[PDB]
């Protein structure tokens, strides 16, 4: 278990994917030309997990860039680390998806899927011990959502024994008041429940709420929201990228965090919260379990934690963390299921992220995540009851039954979270 193949699809996918490469290259001491200018051997130990070594001491990301709108490839290239990506790995179409899930999944997206799969095969064959795949995408658009899920299903058929992990951006009318987004999100969640092993739920509603109420930014932009997304992605991939006591990988995360196959949607959290441009151990433990620090707009005190993985970054006592973590579990005992003993794992890492001397990232599998799914479901039901813009989907080959099946599957998922929320040991 070593190599991860990163795929980024659509506008949101490529935008957050580029920020991820910028934030992790700086942490490993890799400059935009692929040269290592760091000062610690701990940066190069598991560098092969995300980077392919090339001649002349070069490190190229094992990243595949996909989109149907060609303007996205230009915006990525003009970025600071835009030239580091392998030019052969850019696979872009001529006509976009126009925020239509059916165009991404059945017509425009289906004509480019074989070309992307040839590039995926090229990177997977050059892997000594492939762990699996990591995809960044939004669920409210057309390409990341429709073509992103089709890609997941096809990659699943050729590699059924590897882990499929996604960083899925959930829509909110506070950031994009485009009314077809609940349809594209519901049709995608139906696919994600069936075909992924682990999904990090990154909600634009929570990101906007943090920026506007906590960071006091009156008109948040995508750069401000993406500042929080890149900090979360760096935090949740820390133990895949640095040695640490555990030999963490994507399969050990799934076996220990996912008790039921469909309940694989995680609520990430981060502490401290900071704005771009501009803490003791008990404050970081307290802030990690606070609703204001969650990247999904759900109150964890409305549900119960099935499993939790916490990663602390920086110089601190390992005994103080053990005491403080047990302390949070005692005062908040009613918010953890009593039928999964030792359901909280903690890890420490020496190297903190940029600017912050201390850091704490939270990964929770909580029943409160049903609040996020209930919000999308209510928006979907309001639109679908009136059959608004349904012809835009049925005209691209889709049938009405696919909408009712997706709605039924998502409501069944909410009922499944509620079932384990009310479960007792006795």
């Amino acid at each position: 278990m070593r190599e991860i193949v990163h795929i980024q699809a659509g506008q949101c996918g490529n935008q957050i994917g580029a920020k991820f490469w910028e934030v992790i290259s700086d942490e490993h001491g890799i400059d935009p030309t692929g040269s290592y200018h760091g000062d610690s051997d701990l940066q190069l130990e598991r560098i092969n997990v995300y980077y392919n070594e090339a001649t002349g001491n070069k490190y190229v990301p094992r990243a595949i860039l996909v989109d149907l709108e060609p303007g996205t490839m230009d915006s990525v290239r003009s970025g600071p680390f835009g030239q580091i990506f392998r030019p052969d790995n850019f696979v872009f179409g001529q006509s976009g998806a126009g925020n239509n899930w059916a165009k991404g999944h059945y017509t425009e997206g289906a004509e480019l899927v074989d070309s992307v799969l040839d590039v995926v095969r090229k990177e997977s064959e050059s892997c000594d011990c492939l762990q699996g795949f990591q995809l960044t995408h939004s669920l409210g658009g057309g390409t990341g959502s429709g073509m992103g899920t089709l890609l997941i299903s096809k990659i699943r058929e050729e590699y059924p024994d590897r882990i499929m992990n996604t960083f899925s951006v959930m829509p909110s009318p506070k950031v994009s008041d485009t009314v077809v987004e609940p349809y594209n999100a519901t049709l995608s969640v139906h696919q994600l429940v069936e075909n992924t092993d682990e999904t990090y739920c990154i909600d634009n509603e929570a990101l906007y709420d943090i920026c506007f109420r906590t960071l006091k930014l009156t008109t948040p932009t995508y750069g401000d929201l993406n500042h929080l997304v890149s900090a979360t992605m760096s935090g949740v991939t820390t133990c895949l990228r640095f040695p640490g006591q555990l030999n963490a990988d994507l399969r050990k995360l799934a076996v220990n965090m996912v008790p039921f196959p469909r309940l694989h949607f995680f609520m990430p959290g981060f502490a401290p919260l900071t704005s771009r441009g501009s803490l003791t151990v008990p404050e970081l433990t307290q802030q990690m379990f606070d609703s204001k620090n969650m990247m999904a707009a759900c109150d964890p005190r409305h549900g119960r934690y099935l499993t939790v993985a916490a990663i602390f970054r920086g110089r601190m006592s390992m005994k103080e963390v053990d005491e403080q973590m047990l302390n949070v579990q005692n005062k908040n005992s009613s918010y953890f299921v009593e039928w999964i003993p030792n359901n909280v794992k903690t890890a420490v890492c020496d190297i903190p992220p940029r600017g912050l001397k201390m850091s704490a990232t939270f990964i929770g599998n909580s029943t409160a995540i049903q609040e996020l799914f209930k919000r999308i479901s209510e928006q979907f039901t309001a639109m679908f009851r009136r059959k608004a813009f349904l012809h835009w989907y049925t005209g691209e080959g889709m049938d009405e039954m696919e909408f009712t099946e997706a709605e039924s599957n998502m409501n069944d998922l909410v009922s499944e979270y509620q079932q384990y929320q009310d479960a007792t040991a006795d």
Binding site: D249, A254, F260, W339, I340, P341, N343, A425
Partner: protein, 437 residues
């Protein structure tokens, strides 16, 4: 003499094996390159230490040991460390992908890719033996390789070595230094499938060792290095009777005769004393009576349980160092009349005693102080059922909701195997109750 082959499986088995073989080298006077200046017979011999070490024509003394893991990280540390020249390189076997803390991957899917290579390499060591008595198998209960691969290996060794004894050193999980939430499942599954194939198993509770390091050695946050050093000192005291001259537990068969009255209740409790911090280099030397009394204090046990709530079926006392047999007889006499030590009515109420007059060895870099006399008590008590009950309860809490079961069923395992394994543990708890818990 009769040979013994040690097999170290998974991270816990390999790391404890490295600490054990380092201590064995210092006790026998073997250098890291394998040279033994005290051994006059170059190229072979019938000595006590030859049970654990073979000899080459060039005077090299090689452990009769195999290290196996499904991923290379841990065994690579052995291949590049201080004792990298001591082991046969072909007896350090590694795969590429581990069992992901999953018994089913260790036993059925990943473990199947390397089982035949491991048995062929074990056969190469067995061919070099004139009278192999059996195997010592080191592994965790909680790991995917330690649980799954060990049960597959024990199943195969029972077919290919029908009349040879098999002994285990098993690591029982603790919440303080655990790796996975599924460790209770892995522990119950490996206990079920290995029960028929193992003759005697010494469980090492990571919580018992963690507490001893904190209280006696004043280590604030013990790590695996600290735990493994103390564990290797206890394992050495148990295996000393196989590597040196003596009159008690002189072969693997005798461990079964003295500690196992019935095949299923084959889990002896080990107690060890004294454990003194190395920062107290001028500590008062404790008497035979003080160290013998310490064997009946639950705080010095290898498994957390209360022998006062149980009955004894067997009790062996293994001393090392400046111990006069008369002082042992007098200390035991006090233990019989004063204390509430109850034996079963069908066993002779008695203590078997073995004395090795060489003091215990301390490793450079360790946390233990040198002592003039030490004792390891091995007893078969019904109180060890408390350890099985604690583990069965954690299994029941998850299994009632079928939590994590899909990960096992997806890796070539039938759901029925969980209920079959659990009923076998229910019958084991009743076996201790029938004797007298």
């Amino acid at each position: 003499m009769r040979e013994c082959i040690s097999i170290h499986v998974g991270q816990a088995g390999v790391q404890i094996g490295n600490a054990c073989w380092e201590l064995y080298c210092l006790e026998h006077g073997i250098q890291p390159d394998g040279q033994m200046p005290s051994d006059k017979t170059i190229g072979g011999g019938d000595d006590s230490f030859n049970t654990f070490f073979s000899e080459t024509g060039a005077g090299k003394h090689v452990p009769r040991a195999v290290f196996v893991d499904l991923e290379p990280t841990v065994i690579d540390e052995v291949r590049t460390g201080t004792y990298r020249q001591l082991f046969h390189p072909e007896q350090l076997i590694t795969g590429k992908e581990d069992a992901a803390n999953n018994y089913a991957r260790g036993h059925y899917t990943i473990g199947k890719e390397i089982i035949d290579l491991v048995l062929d390499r074990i056969r190469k060591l067995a061919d070099q033996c004139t009278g192999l008595q059996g195997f010592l198998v080191f592994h965790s209960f909680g790991g995917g390789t330690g649980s799954g691969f060990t049960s597959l290996l024990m199943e195969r060794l029972s077919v290919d070595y029908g009349k040879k004894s098999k002994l285990e050193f098993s690591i029982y999980p603790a919440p303080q230094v655990s790796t996975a939430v599924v460790e209770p499942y892995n522990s119950i599954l490996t206990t079920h499938t290995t029960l028929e194939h193992s003759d005697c198993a010494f469980m090492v509770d990571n919580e018992a060792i963690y507490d001893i390091c904190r209280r006696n050695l004043d280590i604030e946050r013990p790590t695996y290095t600290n735990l493994n050093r103390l564990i290797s000192q206890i394992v050495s005291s148990i295996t000393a009777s196989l590597r040196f001259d003596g009159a008690l537990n002189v072969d693997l068969t005798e461990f079964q005769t003295n500690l196992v009255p019935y095949p299923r209740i084959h889990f002896p409790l080990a107690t060890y004393a004294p454990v003194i911090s190395a920062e107290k280099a001028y500590h008062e030397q404790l008497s035979v009576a003080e160290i013998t009394n310490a064997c009946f204090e639950p705080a010095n046990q290898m498994v957390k349980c209360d022998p006062r709530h149980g009955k004894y079926m067997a009790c062996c006392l293994l001393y090392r160092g400046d111990v006069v047999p008369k002082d042992v007889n007098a200390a035991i006499a006090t233990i019989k009349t004063k204390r509430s030590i109850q034996f079963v009515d069908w066993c002779p109420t008695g203590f078997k005693v073995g004395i090795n007059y060489q003091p215990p060895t301390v490793v450079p870099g360790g946390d233990l102080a040198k002592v003039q006399r030490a004792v390891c008590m091995l007893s078969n008590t019904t109180a060890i059922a408390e350890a099985w009950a604690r583990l069965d309860h954690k299994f029941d809490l998850m299994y009632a909701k079928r939590a994590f079961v899909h990960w096992y069923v997806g890796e070539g395992m039938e759901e029925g195997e969980f209920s079959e394994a659990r009923e076998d543990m229910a019958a084991l708890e009743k076996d201790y109750e029938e004797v007298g818990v």
